[PDB]
Design an enzyme around this catalytic site. Structure first.
Site, PDB file in Angstrom:
ATOM      1  N   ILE A  31       0.602  -1.669  -0.032  1.00 52.80           N
ATOM      2  CA  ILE A  31       0.219  -0.082  -0.241  1.00 52.80           C
ATOM      3  C   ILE A  31       1.048   1.821   0.208  1.00 52.80           C
ATOM      4  O   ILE A  31       0.346   2.491   0.452  1.00 52.80           O
ATOM      5  CB  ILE A  31      -1.040   0.308   1.269  1.00 52.80           C
ATOM      6  CG1 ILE A  31      -2.139   0.833   1.273  1.00 52.80           C
ATOM      7  CG2 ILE A  31      -0.190   0.129   2.037  1.00 52.80           C
ATOM      8  CD1 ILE A  31      -3.500   0.579   1.902  1.00 52.80           C
ATOM      9  N   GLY A  92      13.257  -2.529  11.656  1.00 52.12           N
ATOM     10  CA  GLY A  92      11.543  -1.523  11.282  1.00 52.12           C
ATOM     11  C   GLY A  92      10.631  -2.506  11.097  1.00 52.12           C
ATOM     12  O   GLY A  92       9.527  -1.661  10.743  1.00 52.12           O
ATOM     13  N   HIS A  99       6.279 -11.949   6.380  1.00 53.55           N
ATOM     14  CA  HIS A  99       6.512 -11.642   4.991  1.00 53.55           C
ATOM     15  C   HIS A  99       7.472 -11.005   3.900  1.00 53.55           C
ATOM     16  O   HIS A  99       8.657 -10.725   5.340  1.00 53.55           O
ATOM     17  CB  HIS A  99       4.705 -10.373   5.542  1.00 53.55           C
ATOM     18  CG  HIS A  99       5.701  -9.585   5.992  1.00 53.55           C
ATOM     19  ND1 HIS A  99       5.308  -9.232   7.158  1.00 53.55           N
ATOM     20  CD2 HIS A  99       5.998  -8.461   4.970  1.00 53.55           C
ATOM     21  CE1 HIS A  99       5.694  -8.274   7.231  1.00 53.55           C
ATOM     22  NE2 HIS A  99       5.765  -7.245   6.046  1.00 53.55           N
ATOM     23  N   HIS A 101       8.731  -9.008   1.036  1.00 52.39           N
ATOM     24  CA  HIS A 101       8.540  -8.294   0.570  1.00 52.39           C
ATOM     25  C   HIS A 101       9.510  -7.964  -0.962  1.00 52.39           C
ATOM     26  O   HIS A 101      10.769  -8.593  -0.733  1.00 52.39           O
ATOM     27  CB  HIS A 101       9.551  -6.453   1.243  1.00 52.39           C
ATOM     28  CG  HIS A 101       9.313  -6.105   1.494  1.00 52.39           C
ATOM     29  ND1 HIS A 101       8.133  -4.642   1.870  1.00 52.39           N
ATOM     30  CD2 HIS A 101       9.199  -6.165   3.399  1.00 52.39           C
ATOM     31  CE1 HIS A 101       7.868  -4.361   3.036  1.00 52.39           C
ATOM     32  NE2 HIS A 101       8.432  -5.896   3.728  1.00 52.39           N
TER      33      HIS A 101
END
Ligand SMILES: Nc1ncnc2c1ncn2[C@H]1C[C@H](O)[C@@H](COP(=O)(O)O)O1
Ligand SMILES: Nc1ncnc2c1ncn2[C@H]1C[C@H](O)[C@@H](COP(=O)(O)O)O1
EC number: 3.9.1.-
Lengths: 113, 113
Positions: A31, A92, A99, A101
């Site tokens: 998002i 972070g 998950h 990226h």
């Protein structure tokens, strides 16, 4: 509920544009993209973070990377990409559901944050 | 030879400070660290890059992440870390033998390059 954002995506409580789904995982666009292509691959199984994943999760974790590979190819990332896992405060990490990226469509720089 | 730097590390032709070794993989400190802790986890099997890894490599790829987790704990990364795979030109890939970076000991920033 009390689960994470990605728990909610899995149960279709929070919407997402899903680009791959099988019996083990989902992939969807981020998002807040940091590259022209930026998507996430997540297991359907809840594991809060990579630091608590178990030995018998190895196949599942590798499956996230293989699905990442497949999705990157589908999305035309022929010049390459970067895969990232953020663990804990120094990583972070925002969402405590494991998950991966995948970022591409531009030159990625170094250090990786 | 004609293999990669990491092929040479596996065959002990190029030296490295090895922090974990089993029958499937090796982990060693990065020669150009980008964080107070920065190490690599590599399979002993040669796969040139993640984009050519195969479905049956899933367990091996996940094993790299689990070993990364174990090594991060050994090295005291209790505040977290980031794992990275660089693929191809846009990923900045230098060494064409699949591997995982683990970085910690400082706040990692965003975007991840
Ligand atoms: N609702 C929704 N859809 C899609 N992507 C989302 C959503 N909420 C957060 N995110 C993304 C934003 C970050 O890149 C990542 C969480 O940070 P991390 O450091 O990876 O834990 O997940
Ligand atoms: N000889 C030796 N020992 C330890 N680390 C090394 C060595 N040669 C290169 N490297 C590291 C330097 C980069 O972080 C990575 C290669 O870039 P990448 O983008 O990951 O393919 O591997």
């Amino acid at each position: 509920g009390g689960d994470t954002i990605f728990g909610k995506i899995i149960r279709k409580e929070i919407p997402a544009k899903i680009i791959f789904e099988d019996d083990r995982c989902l992939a969807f666009h981020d998002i807040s993209p940091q590259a022209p292509t930026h998507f996430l691959v997540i297991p359907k199984k809840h594991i809060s973070q990579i630091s608590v994943a178990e030995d018998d999760d190895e196949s599942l974790l590798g499956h996230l990377m293989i699905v990442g590979k497949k999705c990157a190819a589908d999305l035309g990332l022929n010049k390459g990409y970067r895969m990232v896992v953020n663990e804990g405060s120094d990583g972070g990490q925002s969402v405590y559901h494991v998950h991966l990226h995948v970022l591409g469509g531009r030159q990625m720089h170094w250090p990786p944050g």
